[PDB]
Symmetry: D2
Subunit: 220 residues, 4 copies
């Protein structure tokens, strides 16, 4: 159970895993009517599959994560269809006062007419007003599913994500990359760390031969 | 195939952009099993009914639709959970968003005893979206990148997307969303999807309602 | 270790599993009696997505005509033995005379078994001849019959596995794949008793699992 | 309907299509709250999407094919899960005397101890014996689903294939390549021709920037 904190209140937590590097090896070797051999040959096979684009053996390694993220990050995340999701419902749950407030450092490198600290304050102010309106509508008898429509996109949500290593590697190619929004790159970095810990050979081979993004080769 | 269009909520819509196939596409795909093709209207319509009541669903995957939908983000989040489909949506990271939000009418609260008049709930919702949208424009004008500025925008912000889906996945969508358990707002969009489906595939739609449809609102 | 022999030379073997009945509870909720009650509630009302968080990996040995029907289940992962790169073994499914008893045949079922065995022997011999003569494996194997045994790894979640059971653990499916589906059901019941029991009770569409223990 | 003969008795036939190059342009432009512009800018956008790996807009172009192929080719083909299939059933149909007999030219480049013409004869001989046994079991009352198990892997089958341009391009990367079996390369070349005819800009851009195989850059 590895847990990595992301942003001001979010996290990525490993809930469960099926298999390891040898799961991909065993699945690849069935093609030749073979099974496992030895650490050197098996690790060499992992590198071979990654170098030649033999991706299907990696589908037999599966992960389950527990993620707490702002809704704008979850909307980008939930576009990855080759995976399983189960999320907190704003129709049935009374939502908590938990929102992503960017730190002033998030606006570094941008020439802004107002200080980054003031942008942080303006964002906090609007979430405070929206959350107060939400509670007022709830207390006045407005059904939850309608009252929440005033809540901003930085509202924190929670979800379970079940994904295989092949789809997870596609997620890393697209999200652990400077073109993805900074907030989701941070989440992808945490996914990469858990992946590296559970599948060191696959992760190392992935970075070496198949990884298409840019930030995982620069950030340890 | 031409541009069917149904207005939903205050500013949304469901528009038919394109379609591939019709009832006979499912007939031709089912008949290949027996080394046959089309026969006649009576036998082919009887085959559609047979397929539907027996759960032979794969022939219906050969009928495909493309829709153009304008919907509030809370509706799009529920909709985008349907993984067996294709999506392409408006980006808040790259587009300067328009002043278009879903403001529920007072009638949306009918059947709920509220401490404040429904008209005042409508006003409170309009007020908070006005404040959030104004803050969003302020941050944009001050040089804050769009992908950060938009995080203060509420869940009733209108978004636009293209949805490509086959009749099998569309029928699953209708079972789940054209039903009283789904949120009222997405039921309205599902009624529009069913209306288009009925027009393009009358035999499939009629057989679906008659033997496989699991929801409750289409039969009323 | 769970391994069940199927047909004359096939099998279904459990290689790995992720999660159990509580994985579907942990996924839905975002106590034994309350959690079983929740599983039954999810199955009864068609809340299927929490069951996608339970995953299985099987190792299956089956005739190619069975594998062709099996591989139609797209929502799963496969990795199979290659006839292009492997020299195939003399392993074919020969139906026993009991497979045909129930059909009025003009020749005894034992003779049908013999005719099938004879033609697979001739095909396999031709295959070895072409291999020995330098014909590439991928071409030489095209003479081998549909009852040739193949081996594969199958990674599937409980939701797609339940769809597989609805369709294959049913009298409309071919008898041969029903036998594999019964073995899949046995392992699934052992690892997820509450989910399997709730599935049989409220969502199972087939007929043979309610009759066969 | 565009029909291309493959092998001795096989074919690839275009049954239906939804959309064209402009479908992808339209789906990509929603990101910027835009639609179509002009031929030069819209074709430039297709090239841009292919060059930077923006693949999802191409999912909105869908094709339906009617293919006749040997079962060993169909087994490799049916591994492409992101698609729809409906095939001839050996359980319910009395199968025809239609088998793939390789020509002597198929064995060119391989040093064989027996002439290629003799390999062709040996293959024909064993299919003749197997087909005769199949008919005798059928005539004796053996159910079709059992009688067919003696039929060899070169037996011709027929199927409908519904696939979008993104999954079709994945199919071309893997099957229109020298690593794939020669027989399925012949089918992939026919798929490529129909794709080029219906989506010239997408096909041209695909070959230019995203195509991973080798034979489509050599063969017109
Ligand atoms: C930087 C950046 C910018 C954007 C976007 C992403 C990124 C990283 N996206 C999101 C993008 O369109 C896409 O939805 C996600 O990145 C998921 O990518 P996959 O489809 O590869 O993942 P997913 O997990 O859904 O699929 C994994 C793989 O399966 C295959 N696949 C799955 N379903 C398929 C199907 N139905 N047909 C064919 N192949 C299928 C593909 O091979 C895919 O790579 C986007 N989106 C948007 O709408 N507007 C935008 O402006 C942007 N902008
Ligand atoms: C009234 C109501 C209430 C809720 C919800 C829905 C509705 C209608 N949901 C959403 C729900 O869990 C689900 O995501 C959507 O209904 C999409 O359903 P499908 O998976 O059937 O569609 P989708 O299009 O994703 O799949 C279509 C079909 O493909 C199959 N399928 C696709 N992907 C699969 C996979 N990976 N494994 C196995 N089979 C797969 C299944 O057969 C499925 O029926 C939910 N969600 C949530 O997180 N929290 C909640 O509280 C709620 N509440
Ligand atoms: C008794 C019997 C008889 C036959 C057949 C099956 C059985 C049980 N079949 C095979 C059948 O058409 C089908 O291919 C398999 O049963 C796989 O079933 P699913 O598609 O449900 O599983 P699969 O694993 O492919 O999908 C699981 C679920 O995800 C969803 N799904 C997955 N992919 C989808 C997609 N592309 N579009 C929409 N939804 C999608 C559906 O909800 C589906 O139930 C067949 N086949 C044939 O070609 N000819 C035949 O004559 C027969 N006969
Ligand atoms: C030359 C050659 C040689 C071989 C093989 C292929 C080729 C081209 N294969 C087949 C291979 O393993 C694979 O099944 C097919 O190429 C289908 O490829 P996709 O998964 O890309 O297509 P498919 O159409 O199924 O999927 C398209 C895309 O969707 C995504 N995808 C779909 N389902 C997914 C899932 N469940 N998890 C993650 N991502 C998913 C991926 O991004 C994928 O590229 C093989 N097979 C074998 O078993 N033994 C062998 O020896 C060989 N040998
Ligand atoms: O009727 C519902 C309720 C929930 N969800 C999904 C969408 C989100 O991913 C998550 C929470 O949605 P809300 O309940 O907050 O709308 O569950 C739906 O698809 N439909
Ligand atoms: O980097 C991006 C940009 C967009 N999208 C998807 C998510 C939404 O479905 C839609 C718009 O996202 P925003 O650009 O508004 O974040 O496109 C992503 O997945 N990643
Ligand atoms: O019971 C059946 C019948 C057919 N099919 C699929 C598998 C093949 O793709 C095709 C023909 O299979 P046979 O009927 O020849 O076994 O249809 C099944 O999956 N199950
Ligand atoms: O080039 C290949 C080799 C294998 N496979 C898949 C198809 C079968 O499921 C299995 C074995 O195919 P053969 O190598 O026996 O043709 O792997 C392919 O799709 N393409």
């Amino acid at each position: 159970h590895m847990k990595i904190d992301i942003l001001d209140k979010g996290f990525v937590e490993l809930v469960d895993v099926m298999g390891n590097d040898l799961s991909a090896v065993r699945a690849a070797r069935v093609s030749f009517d073979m099974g496992l051999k030895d650490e050197e040959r098996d690790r060499h096979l992992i590198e071979y599959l990654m170098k030649h684009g033999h991706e299907t053996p990696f589908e037999h390694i599966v992960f389950t994560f527990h993620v707490k993220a702002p809704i704008f990050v979850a909307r980008q995340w939930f576009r990855h269809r080759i995976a399983s999701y189960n999320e907190l419902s704003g129709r049935y749950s009374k939502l908590s006062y938990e929102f992503y407030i960017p730190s002033p450092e998030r606006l570094e490198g941008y020439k802004t007419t107002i200080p980054p600290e003031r942008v942080t304050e303006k964002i906090s102010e609007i979430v405070d007003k929206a959350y107060r309106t939400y509670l007022e509508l709830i207390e006045s008898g407005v059904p939850r599913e309608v009252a929440r429509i005033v809540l901003p996109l930085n509202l924190y949500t929670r979800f379970f994500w079940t994904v295989n290593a092949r789809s997870l590697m596609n997620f890393l190619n697209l999200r652990a990359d400077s073109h993805a929004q900074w907030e989701i790159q941070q989440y992808a970095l945490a996914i990469a760390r858990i992946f590296k810990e559970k599948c060191p050979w696959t992760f190392e081979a992935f970075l070496k031969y198949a990884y298409k993004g840019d930030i995982l080769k620069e950030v340890q």
